[PDB]
Scaffold this active site. Sequence first.
Site, PDB file in Angstrom:
ATOM      1  N   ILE A  55      -7.360   8.030  11.059  1.00 41.13           N
ATOM      2  CA  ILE A  55      -6.457   6.941  11.414  1.00 41.13           C
ATOM      3  C   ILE A  55      -5.410   6.905  10.337  1.00 41.13           C
ATOM      4  O   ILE A  55      -5.729   6.751   9.156  1.00 41.13           O
ATOM      5  CB  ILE A  55      -7.198   5.604  11.489  1.00 41.13           C
ATOM      6  CG1 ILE A  55      -8.344   5.661  12.514  1.00 41.13           C
ATOM      7  CG2 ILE A  55      -6.224   4.442  11.806  1.00 41.13           C
ATOM      8  CD1 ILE A  55      -7.933   6.202  13.879  1.00 41.13           C
ATOM      9  N   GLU A  56      -4.158   7.060  10.732  1.00 41.81           N
ATOM     10  CA  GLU A  56      -3.134   7.253   9.728  1.00 41.81           C
ATOM     11  C   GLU A  56      -2.137   6.098   9.669  1.00 41.81           C
ATOM     12  O   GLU A  56      -1.231   6.075   8.847  1.00 41.81           O
ATOM     13  CB  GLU A  56      -2.527   8.655   9.870  1.00 41.81           C
ATOM     14  CG  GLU A  56      -3.647   9.724   9.728  1.00 41.81           C
ATOM     15  CD  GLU A  56      -3.154  11.102   9.340  1.00 41.81           C
ATOM     16  OE1 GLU A  56      -1.980  11.393   9.669  1.00 41.81           O
ATOM     17  OE2 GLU A  56      -3.953  11.890   8.735  1.00 41.81           O
ATOM     18  N   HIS A  57      -2.347   5.103  10.510  1.00 41.98           N
ATOM     19  CA  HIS A  57      -1.545   3.888  10.419  1.00 41.98           C
ATOM     20  C   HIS A  57      -2.344   2.749  10.998  1.00 41.98           C
ATOM     21  O   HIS A  57      -3.348   2.971  11.706  1.00 41.98           O
ATOM     22  CB  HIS A  57      -0.202   4.048  11.140  1.00 41.98           C
ATOM     23  CG  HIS A  57      -0.291   4.817  12.420  1.00 41.98           C
ATOM     24  ND1 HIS A  57       0.008   6.160  12.501  1.00 41.98           N
ATOM     25  CD2 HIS A  57      -0.641   4.432  13.672  1.00 41.98           C
ATOM     26  CE1 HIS A  57      -0.158   6.570  13.746  1.00 41.98           C
ATOM     27  NE2 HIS A  57      -0.550   5.541  14.476  1.00 41.98           N
TER      28      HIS A  57
END
Length: 271
Positions: A126-128
């Site tokens: 999960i990058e944001h």
Amino acid sequence: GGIVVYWGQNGGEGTLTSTCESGLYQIVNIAFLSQFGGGRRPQINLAGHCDPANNGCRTVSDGIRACQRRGIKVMLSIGGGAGSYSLSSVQDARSVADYIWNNFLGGRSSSRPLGDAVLDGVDFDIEHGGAYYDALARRLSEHNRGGKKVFLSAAPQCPFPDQSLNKALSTGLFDYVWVQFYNNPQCEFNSGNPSNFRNSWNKWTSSFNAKFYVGLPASPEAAGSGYVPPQQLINQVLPFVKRSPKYGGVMLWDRFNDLKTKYSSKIKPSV
């Protein structure tokens, strides 16, 4: 320890079957369920491998099975750096978890994007955002007494805390954490200055009860920074990280680059 690898984001990296048949890997993360949450239609993206339009990636189940027949765990990786995804609420997170359960895990769906194979778990890349991924993990976890039987992994970036994964990881439900020690100069391994990495590894491993993997780029081409030549990894990183009882091995981004450099083959005997 084991080697974890991502597959799915480079259509030139060969099949999932081939990936698992290589014998290099203990866990393969299928990257990615790149779209979900927020009322979005969930979508996988496997780059040039297959077009998920009307489940054109259903044959991936052959690879999943090939992997599982060799005792290799195959995780659905959710998120990634390209997709549009985020969670709007706890209910949304639960809805997405249920969608994943039904479409990729032990649940039921007439339109399973990767076919009827039952993945072993879910990898949170999960990058944001970060909001409600705890609820998502918790909902997936509900099958660890219901099920079967859902491993949870997370791929936080090394700077602590990872703002996108901290909430999810705070649940304590994650089985595996491969910390990305690349594209993050503050915590990448550097032979001349290993303390940044060693402190980071120490902090991560001390902060969660999971099996920890050293997340690395499999080639210098796979990261702007943080690549560790396999001999350095073997000689300098592994003797240190192996001191952690939580040490699980090394995670590599990605199958394509690993194929290119044979990185895993070089470190396999040492991990």
